[PDB]
């Protein structure tokens, strides 16, 4: 199971961020499987952004809702995240993570991507 | 030629109990020795037949009914047992002949925060006939003319969700259940082996 | 109440047993499962313990988890030199309806 993010890493303020998590080893048509996004500023604690189950249940971080949109392209086995109105405080690393089944309870964040450092400046 | 037991037991997305999913299985060489390798089978009981003597008999037509219910309600899937899901959204006759198979699936159906996608009928006018399915979601009757899909003195709504989470006790965890129905009288056998 | 707090430093020494605390509230840590991650300099974190007591395949035995009321603890046995890294809490908060994390602990062996 592998994940990899991609997109534009540098963007000015008042523009929009787009990211694309391409994965391999599981399909978002089975039961259980889901994909989420987690950002981490440089030298701070982790932060949860959004999540999308296999039946298209788009959970969002409430404080960051009204700004985020996550969607899937299952045919291409890829997920797209979009966040408008970026700011210099949003410079961070963004991981795309995977939630599959365990042995008696669902597993969450078992596998991670490799990050994509995103800088918001001029 | 084998028949799809690996499709009804390994289905991609099970159904909710109020809209259960029937399927027919005929014209194959049925092998019941694949089921045991599936799960510890929290519930495996047979009416009118034994599970070990299953691989040598011949049947007329075999139906398979799959859906998902709660933990402490699996006991209601049996002939002549009165309850709430055996009363409003799935009833099987008192002359049943077949088997039921239920295994715990908290691994794949419980979302963190609540899975409000598996619902069940809570209100109906009269109990339903055996092997009957209804899907209409009409608003239920009240003392007085119900409101309109809104709150009021009564004016309730029929369906109710489940809310599965990974921390619920075993009595409230989601269970997947599949029911096999056979026929044996004057059989120019169509499925066995 | 809605944010988990951890002490920043552990400071053990090889071949010893240490514990790492995580204090929550009635709403997040006391009514949900508590995860425990581990994050090394210049690398994505890596799961250590889910469901308060279970280890994903590929984790040594020395890591143990414990939940008690509105508190959580991680017990590391056989402390070694390949473990000095950040350790994080994680829990789903129903009142906020989101995942919340802790600050992190250093745990540099001597």
Residue numbers in the entry:
A (entry chain C): 2 to 123
B (entry chain B): 334 to 526
C (entry chain A): 1 to 110
The authors write:
Elite nAbs, mainly derived from the IGHV2–5 and IGHV3-66/53 germlines, showed potent neutralizing activity across Wuhan-Hu-1, Delta, Omicron sublineages BA.1 and BA.2 at picomolar NT50 values. In this study, we used single-cell sequencing technology to isolate hundreds of monoclonal antibodies from convalescent patients of BA.1 breakthrough infection and identified dozens of elite antibodies with NT50 values at the picomolar level. To further analyze the molecular basis for these elite nAbs, we determined the structure of Fab in complex with Omicron BA.4/5 S-trimers by cryo-EM combined with X-ray crystallography. Next, we evaluated the epitopes of these elite antibodies and found that these antibodies mainly fall into two distinct groups, which was consistent with the results of the epitope competition assay.
TH027 shares the same IGHV origin and is tightly bound to BA.4/5 S with a similar binding mode to TH272, with a longer HCDR3 loop at a length of 15 amino acids, resulting in a larger BSA of over 800 Å2. The HCDR3 loop of TH027 forms more hydrophobic interactions and hydrogen bonds with RBD, mainly contributed by P102, N105, and Y109 with N439, L441, and V445. In addition, P107 also forms van der Waals interactions with N439, K440, and S443. This stronger interaction may explain the 5-fold higher neutralizing activity of TH027 than TH272 against the Omicron BA.4/5 pseudovirus. Unfortunately, TH027 did not show any binding activity towards BQ.1.1, XBB, and XBB.1.5. However, TH027 and TH272 were significantly escaped by BQ.1.1 and XBB variants, likely due to the K444T mutation in BQ.1.1 and CH.1.1, which disrupts the salt bridge within the interface. The V445P and G446S mutations in XBB and XBB.1.5 may induce local conformational changes and create steric hindrance, leading to the immune evasion of TH027 and TH272 by XBB or XBB.1.5.
